Design a protein around this nucleic acid. Sequence first.
DNA 1: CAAGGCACATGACAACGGTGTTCAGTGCCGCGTTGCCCGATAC
DNA 2: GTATCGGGCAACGCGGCACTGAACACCGTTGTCATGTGCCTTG
Lengths: 131, 131, 131, 131
Amino acid sequence: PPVKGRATRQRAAVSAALQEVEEFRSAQELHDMLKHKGDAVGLTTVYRTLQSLADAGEVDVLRTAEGESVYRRCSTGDHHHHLVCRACGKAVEVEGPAVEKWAEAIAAEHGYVNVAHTVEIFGTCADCAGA
Amino acid sequence: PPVKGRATRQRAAVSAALQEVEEFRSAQELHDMLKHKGDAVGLTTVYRTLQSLADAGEVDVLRTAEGESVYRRCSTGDHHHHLVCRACGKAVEVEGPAVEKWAEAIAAEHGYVNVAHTVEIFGTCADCAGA
Amino acid sequence: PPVKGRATRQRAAVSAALQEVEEFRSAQELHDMLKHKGDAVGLTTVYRTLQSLADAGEVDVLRTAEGESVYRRCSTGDHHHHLVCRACGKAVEVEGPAVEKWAEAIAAEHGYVNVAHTVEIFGTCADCAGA
Amino acid sequence: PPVKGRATRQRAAVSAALQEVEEFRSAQELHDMLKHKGDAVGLTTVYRTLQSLADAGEVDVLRTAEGESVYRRCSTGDHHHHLVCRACGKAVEVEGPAVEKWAEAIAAEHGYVNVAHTVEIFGTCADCAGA
DNA sequence: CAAGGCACATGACAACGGTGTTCAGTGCCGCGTTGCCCGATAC
DNA sequence: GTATCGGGCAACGCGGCACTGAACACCGTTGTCATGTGCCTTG
Ligand SMILES: [Zn+2]
Ligand SMILES: [Zn+2]
Ligand SMILES: [Zn+2]
Ligand SMILES: [Zn+2]
Ligand SMILES: [Zn+2]
Ligand SMILES: [Zn+2]
Ligand SMILES: [Zn+2]
Ligand SMILES: [Zn+2]
Ligand SMILES: [Zn+2]
Ligand SMILES: [Zn+2]
Ligand SMILES: [Zn+2]
Ligand SMILES: [Zn+2]
């Protein structure tokens, strides 16, 4: 995820960290990892870099029920929904043509000016269910 | 809106406000409406009664971008999703058989033990765009 | 370390950590220890409690060369001075009456109506020098 | 006022401004003085040249309560402790042998390999007390 | 019907855990500059 | 042989834009203390 602005070690390090993690992680959880790495990127810098890469669309952003937003790096450039397990903290990338068609059809039925479908699935995997 | 908690004048006043407005409203906004009525239900009372109704199932919960939870009363007890306009705060109930099937299919392919899917569409109204 | 206002678990949690620690530590450093302890006090909560305890005099505060203030609970509330080992991150309490008298005499020569005398020492122990 | 860095017009201007002031001055404030003179020396250049002079020991430094760095040029080459009035912002150099001996003695019994003793006094002068 | 018996209730505070804004302070990549450094010069 | 002269010069200056460290501010939610309101047997 190349940052749009002039490259610096801190922004490059957060970009590398997003590639290193394949799970949705909040800024506080990522900043703690970078502090343990010894990179020295500040919590405020981690917030600014995560927001810039997410605005570019390089990293996907999701919100939990608690209201804490989480950011993950996605291999697929194309838009897709996600099935996420809270216990794993990891998400699966899946895209639905039918759900997208249903959202457009619902917008057509109500004559809504624009469509911004937000389909997200939250389920726990069998491995986490086992204890 | 039947409330599981012991019956009191305060619970009835907030329940009346929920029935009065179909559109999603924040707990603070509902408290302000009760203050205007003269019911003067306490903010700590409005927050507790809204949350209690939600666990019972009388009210449905949604997340505004600002991150403030909003509560509305729904006539139908069947599973449904909401097509809501952020600009006008107007919510219309929408149901799709295909979205249920797609969510079930993603859960089945990944073999997650328990899965619950939350879906909503954000669009402006044709009347709203009209000037 | 007591806080003047009504006590809560979070105020007690930061106070317990300051009593447990025998060295000066920053708000961010103390917060990471508490997060691992599972107390779950927020960084803003760590800052508000630390500042209140320091005002009471329960915890003595020293300013580091970097400029990030570090807080520690001293053995006695009596006035004293500290010699800090940078490698240890811990200090030894030593007070000189003569230095206070010297500061008072020179302050009187200055003509100051009232004066505040502060002394700090930065060094390293013989054991810390060995590597 | 010698500068370790290669001599140039900008370095001549910052050194002259430091010579003119006999009180602790913020690096940004010295830059403000230089633009007022019309020297138009760069702020980044003012910061690096002040740091080089401080490393040389030509101009002394003090850490303020806010934590910003202030630089004062001193007539006396020999070591001393600055008594800076909080109200005036001006410092009079006073040296005490006893405080140095006390710091050395406590460090020696503690067994510290090396120690640096720093003493600062802050008070309002009788003239400043007058209003 | 009213006093008791008891509970659940309320509300006003007193708190808080996120994410966002000021800073002095410092990366950076272009510029410039200065005493040195040499090659002449025609005498 | 000296000496002043033009010009190049490469290892260094400079400045402006740009971006970063902690400490601090906001805002929807509560956790903790007290008391008035509601009902049920017992009289
Ligand atoms: Zn994705
Ligand atoms: Zn989609
Ligand atoms: Zn799982
Ligand atoms: Zn509904
Ligand atoms: Zn559904
Ligand atoms: Zn609309
Ligand atoms: Zn102490
Ligand atoms: Zn003292
Ligand atoms: Zn040591
Ligand atoms: Zn000095
Ligand atoms: Zn004064
Ligand atoms: Zn001394």
